[PDB]
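=== Structure Prediction Worksheet ===
Name of assembly: unnamed complex
Input type: mixed (protein and possibly other molecules)
Chain count: two
Listed entries:
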Amino acid sequence: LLEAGVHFGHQTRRWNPKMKRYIFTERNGIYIIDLQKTVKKVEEAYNFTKNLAAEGGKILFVGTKKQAQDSVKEEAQRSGMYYVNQRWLGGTLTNFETIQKRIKRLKDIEKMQEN
RNA sequence: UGGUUGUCGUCAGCUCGUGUCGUGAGAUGUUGGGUUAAGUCCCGCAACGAGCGCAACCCUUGAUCUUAGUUGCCAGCAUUCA
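=== Predicted Assembly ===
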């Protein structure tokens, strides 16, 4: 079922054998995904992500491509969660506390320029 | 041995935290592009920072404003060997 989408999906010769369970093959040389194996997977993603945003860890939305910038930004500012619109800084999660320091610095200085 | 100095060298380096990579020694930052007197600064980056250095503040000289005119100065006021 094509619900709304446009994705046949991507790549030429550089492709991964671990997606043999998901794709088809066009005579173009660019691969077309079996969308019947797409609708059910986004359905389970939909359900489990409803459960996760029902429990209360917020959600990270991270997109670090020129296509991904305005999309992930506007979508997370629509949903209220935590986005990445530019580079993904090395160690936001495993190095979490020194990023909390630098974001508190940003909070101090953006309060400082008006208060 | 303390303390105090030379020298590399006023060279621009030397490190650390947390993270990640590596079996480990180590790596990373600190590399790359431009830039600088400068690891100076920017941009990209598995890194984000920080410290000692670099620079700046400090002293002098270069100029002008205010205060302050004696022992310093003599512009217009006359006398003076001055």
